[PDB]
Write a protein that binds this ligand. Structure first.
Ligand SMILES: Cc1ccccc1CNC(=O)[C@H]1N(C(=O)[C@@H](O)[C@H](Cc2ccccc2)NC(=O)c2cccc(O)c2C)CSC1(C)C
Lengths: 99, 99
C-alpha cells in the first residue's frame, strides 16, 4: 500500500507467531527489535544510533512478516526505543520512498 | 521520484545558505542537523533513539531546500552523527513509503 508520513509509520509485524508493532525506518540500515525469544545461535554486533553505540544480538535468517509480507533475514535484538524495520528488510518487501 | 532502499537514501540539501548531505529518515519525527548557525530564537530539547538521548537546539520556521523543493518547518541542531530529514519535512515534499 501507500503510507503517508503525517504520523509515525507504525505497522503490525509477526515474529515467532507473535504480533508486534514496528516502525518502517528508512534511516536504519538494520532491523532492531526489543528483547524476545528467537531460535538458533546469535553473534555480536554494535550499531551506532543517535545517542551512541550499543551492543545487540544478531540472529540471521529469521522469519518475519511485515504488514502481510514475509521476509527472512537478519534481526538484531537489543535496547531499542521502538521495534525498527530497517532497509535490510524494507528491501525484501519491495518498499520504496516516493515523491 | 522513486528511491530504492538498497543503500542509504542520501540527498543534498541547502539550509542556512549551506549545502549538506542528509538522510531521508521515516523513523525520525523531526529533522536534526549537525552544529551550524541558524537565524531566529531557539529553545533546548532532548531527543532519543538507539544509544540514548542528545540535547539539541530547536528552531522553528526554518526553510530548507531539498531535491528541487522548498520546505519549511522545525529543525533541531545538535551533536547528531547523521544529518537526517524527518517526517515533519518529508511530508511537505510529499514523501510516501510504498510496497
Ligand atoms: C532523529 C530524531 C528527531 C526527532 C526526535 C527523535 C529523533 C531520534 N529518533 C531516532 O533515533 C529513531 N531512529 C531513526 O530514525 C533511525 O533512522 C536512525 C537515524 C540515525 C542514523 C545515524 C545516526 C543517528 C541517527 N538510524 C539508526 O539508529 C541506525 C543507523 C544505522 C544502522 C542501524 O542498525 C540503525 C538502527 C531509530 S530509533 C528511533 C525510531 C527513535
Amino acid at each position: 500500500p501507500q503510507i503517508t508520513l503525517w504520523k509515525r509509520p507504525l505497522v503490525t509485524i509477526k515474529i515467532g507467531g507473535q504480533l508486534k508493532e514496528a516502525l518502517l525506518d528508512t534511516g536504519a540500515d538494520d532491523t532492531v527489535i526489543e528483547e524476545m525469544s528467537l531460535p538458533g545461535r546469535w553473534k555480536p554486533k554494535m550499531i551506532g544510533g543517535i545517542g551512541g553505540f550499543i551492543k545487540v544480538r544478531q540472529y540471521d535468517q529469521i522469519i518475519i512478516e511485515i504488514c502481510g509480507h514475509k521476509a527472512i533475514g537478519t534481526v538484531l535484538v537489543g535496547p531499542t526505543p521502538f521495534n525498527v524495520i530497517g532497509r535490510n528488510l524494507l528491501t525484501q518487501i519491495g518498499c520504496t520512498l516516493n515523491f
